[PDB]
Design a protein around this ligand. Structure first.
Ligand code: HEM
Ligand SMILES: CC(=O)/C=C/C1=C(C)CCCC1(C)C
Length: 396
């Protein structure tokens, strides 16, 4: 049965956890919703809206006042549990908490972090280069995001090996452990780091954030719990997918690989264009006020799903979106990879550096890689799309 306020022509059954063809190609899968109305109602997953044209994706994603970030996901009970700070807050609450978190991730700090984050990326590269091949997802993409985390909070080097294992269970698969247990496992992982740094603040990421006030008052212990968790998680799944799609891109365009080994001065621009090119994040909102859009109305209560890839790769919003070209003059905030509006990734600057440093180490130190001849590339769906297997070969 469909609600009165949803025209029957807008009804689809698209399932956002498996768009069909998602395993073969994440983006085409999503891109099929372009041949249809700009805002449709999906009967899967308990019934919700999906934004399906870039103007709609972009406009709704900015409506932070009428579209709340509180449900977190379309899966009942998952928002209630994780309570991400800032990611799940509205209005003034969200303004207060965002300020010092943001300030923790300021340019000079990302910039200061460059050398250290590169060496990490390089060390991982070197542990693989002798092999002549690798499952890049499981051996690199899924492993660098946690390493960098370790380096952002500056854990002492002795501990890093023990803490990488501890951490590996929760970067991340699925995966028959409740939403509740998951959050317990990351709080337990994170807690020790929090005690040390609310006690003896250092100059790493968390200390910096934890010594700033929140609207005048000091962080409570639970808020730091919620905000740290949020930094951890916000930094793992998305970065890996991205680093993944970038290594993808290069295995399938060896000519870029040469453009880039020849013109390493071109890496920054290529990061920005690659990041516009392969965005795989999608978010939910819950309507707190009735919102008109695309000549229809979303009602208080309704859930809304926002795939960034229907903005960036909608040819109606960007010329030849599927072309990696170097003459757009597009500022990154003009596309929706890292989101839009009040909720726009605090970690933008850092991600972009992250990718750059990967390119710099991956293209400099490595020889010419390619896809393996007899192993497929496959991706997955959900909120953070990604490859689930990326077999890559090269002459050691
Ligand atoms: C691959 C790189 C990344 C991508 C594609 C990505 C994607 C996003 C997107 C789309 C949002 C907006 C979410 C929304 O409006 O619902 C977001 C926000 C957020 N990201 Fe990222 N992210 C990335 C990296 C990071 C990193 C490196 C960190 C921190 C270590 C991080 C921490 C956060 C947090 C806390 C927010 C919430 C901001 C708020 O509500 O004010 N992310 N990210
Ligand atoms: C449910 C969960 O464990 C992950 C939640 C998320 C993160 C950290 C990144 C941005 C939004 C999203 C993709 C929902």
């Amino acid at each position: 049965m469909i609600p009165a306020h949803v025209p029957a022509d807008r009804v689809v059954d698209f399932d956002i956890f498996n768009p069909p063809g998602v395993e073969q190609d994440y983006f085409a899968a999503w891109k099929t919703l372009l041949d249809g109305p700009g805002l449709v109602w999906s009967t899967a997953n308990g019934g919700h809206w999906i934004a399906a044209r870039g103007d709609v994706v972009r406009e709704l994603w900015g409506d932070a006042e009428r579209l709340s970030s509180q449900c977190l996901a379309v899966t009942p009970g998952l928002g209630k549990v994780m309570q991400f700070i800032p990611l799940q807050q509205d209005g003034a609450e969200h303004k207060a908490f965002r300020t010092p978190v943001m300030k923790g991730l300021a340019s000079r700090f990302v910039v200061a972090l460059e050398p250290k984050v590169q060496a990490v990326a390089r060390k991982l590269m070197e542990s693989l280069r002798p092999r002549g091949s690798c499952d890049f997802v499981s051996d690199f993409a899924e492993i660098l995001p946690l390493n960098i985390f370790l380096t952002l909070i500056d854990v002492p080097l002795e501990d890093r090996p023990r803490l990488r294992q501890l951490g590996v269970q929760l970067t991340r698969p699925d995966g028959s452990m409740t939403v509740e247990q998951l959050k317990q496992a990351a709080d337990d992982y994170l807690w020790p780091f929090i005690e040390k740094r609310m006690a003896q603040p250092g100059d790493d990421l968390f200390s910096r954030i934890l010594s700033e006030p929140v609207g005048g008052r000091p962080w409570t212990v639970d808020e730091a719990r919620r905000m740290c968790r949020n930094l951890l998680f916000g930094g793992l799944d998305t970065v890996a997918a991205m680093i993944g799609m970038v290594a993808l891109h290069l295995a399938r365009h060896p000519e870029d690989q040469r453009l880039l080994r020849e013109r390493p001065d071109l890496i920054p621009a290529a990061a920005d264009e690659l990041m516009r090119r392969y965005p795989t994040v999608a978010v939910s909102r819950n309507a707190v006020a009735d919102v008109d859009a695309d000549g229809v109305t979303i009602r208080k209560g309704d859930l809304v799903y926002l795939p960034s890839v229907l903005h960036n790769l909608d040819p109606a919003s960007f010329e030849a979106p599927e072309e990696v070209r170097f003459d757009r003059g597009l500022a990154p905030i003009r596309h929706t990879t890292m989101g839009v509006g009040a909720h726009r990734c605090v970690g933008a600057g850092l991600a972009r550096m992250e990718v750059i440093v990967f390119l710099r180490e991956w293209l400099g130190g490595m020889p010419e890689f390619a896809l393996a001849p007899d192993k497929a590339v496959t991706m997955k769906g959900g909120n953070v799309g990604a490859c689930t297997a990326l077999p890559l070969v090269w002459r050691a």
